[PDB]
Structure 1
């Protein structure tokens, strides 16, 4: 079952690129901290939506997040799939603002440095206030999350703003007693109800 963010279906702006852009699935280990993919930065460089990111100065898009954890039934682990609305990250023990390479991670996305505080000063223990599902391999092998337009501006630039941020976190680390084995995190994102205006040069 889907868990549409705050109980509303995404739509066009009031008065093509819906392919499920499956990412390169990350290895989940026991020592895996967690992986975050900022949207649309996780899809800024891949696909026709990725070309629409460069070719348009402004954009709006919902995202149909689908995380797949193909596992044996003997495997153990629940990941918090949380789609943070507007995840301003932080760096540990520094007053410096985190730069381009710590945030603009591209299609592969960034790993989590200290995910217990969600790398932003908050707590992940409360981060279930978010759009959120569970991929507890006891019962749930695949979760999905529906994301509407999340920006105070109605329609803004993709290449210098992340509206949503996927974060797949092992709150419980993997268990199969061969430390860890297989279990990829197939994160597939479809930009649904996508709309692009401002036909300018491909930035």
Structure 2
């Protein structure tokens, strides 16, 4: 339903549904590195650690469950080669804090995208808007996105799906919670 083909390119059907995250009024955001998220689940993960090689696209579906009395806006953006950065040190991020698996991570500074760039300009990447008063779902189709024709799934994350609440969730009660469900369906997985 109104999918977004990234960069105007259209490259199975398992739709690995990750554990839903809780959107609170103080949430900063969540991110998943696409090859790493599915590296430990399903036939995708089994084939990934069976072979030294991998080549495929992705299909992303993000859905929220909220009532008509809820308000908020989400930016569902897929960042290619989202090389993260540290906040107050010159040392590079480590393997533990980069490869978060299917659990994913949270944005420390969503304003600067944990990269030092601007969130306001993040719309240049393939993205969709989830405004709770108009829609509650977003679908993005991701192409190959690699300089090399071949890649190592266990060492390089080609895509990073980021969900950032631009407008915080709100309702009459001071505490609000709205589940967010992320489903990833690799296509032509190798």
| CA shift for structure 1 position 5 | 0.5
Q: Which residue of 2 aligns with 1:3?
A: 4
| CA shift for structure 1 position 35 | 0.4
Tell me how many residue pairs correspond in the alignment. 188
Matches within 5 A, 1:42-191: 42-191=37-186
Q: Is the 8 A contact 1:174 1:180 kept in 2?
A: no
Q: Per-residue displacement from partner, 1:14-34 (whole Å, max 9, x unpaired)?
A: xxxx30000001101111010
Alpha-carbon separation, structure 2, partners of 1:179 and 1:57: 50
RMSD between aligned residues? 1.0
Q: Is the 8 A contact 1:65 1:145 kept in 2?
A: yes
TM-score, structure 1 as length reference: 0.90
Q: Per-residue displacement from partner, 1:85-122 (whole Å, max 9, x unpaired)?
A: 11000010111100011110010101111111000111
Alpha-carbon separation, structure 2, partners of 1:52 and 1:145: 24
| CA shift for structure 1 position 158 | 0.5
Q: Is the 8 A contact 2:128 2:138 kept in 1?
A: yes
| CA shift for structure 1 position 153 | 1.1
TM-score, structure 2 as length reference: 0.96
Instruction: Structure 1: state its 5+ residue gaps.
Output: 11-17, 196-203
Q: Is the 8 A contact 2:25 2:176 kept in 1?
A: no
Q: Is the 8 A contact 2:28 2:110 kept in 1?
A: yes
| CA shift for structure 1 position 193 | 2.2
Q: Per-residue displacement from partner, 1:34-90 (whole Å, max 9, x unpaired)?
A: 000001111111111011111111101111100001110111111100000110000
Alpha-carbon separation, structure 2, partners of 1:180 and 1:43: 32
Instruction: Structure 2: state its 5+ residue gaps.
Output: none
Alpha-carbon separation, structure 2, partners of 1:187 and 1:60: 22
Which runs of 4 or more aligned residues in structure 1 lie more than 3 Å from their structure 2 counterparts after TM superposition?
none
Alpha-carbon separation, structure 1, partners of 2:173 and 2:150: 48
Q: Is the 8 A contact 2:25 2:177 kept in 1?
A: no
Alpha-carbon separation, structure 2, partners of 1:179 and 1:61: 44
Residues 1:177 and 1:101: Cα distance change in structure 2 (over 3 Å): farther
Alpha-carbon separation, structure 1, partners of 2:149 and 2:93: 26
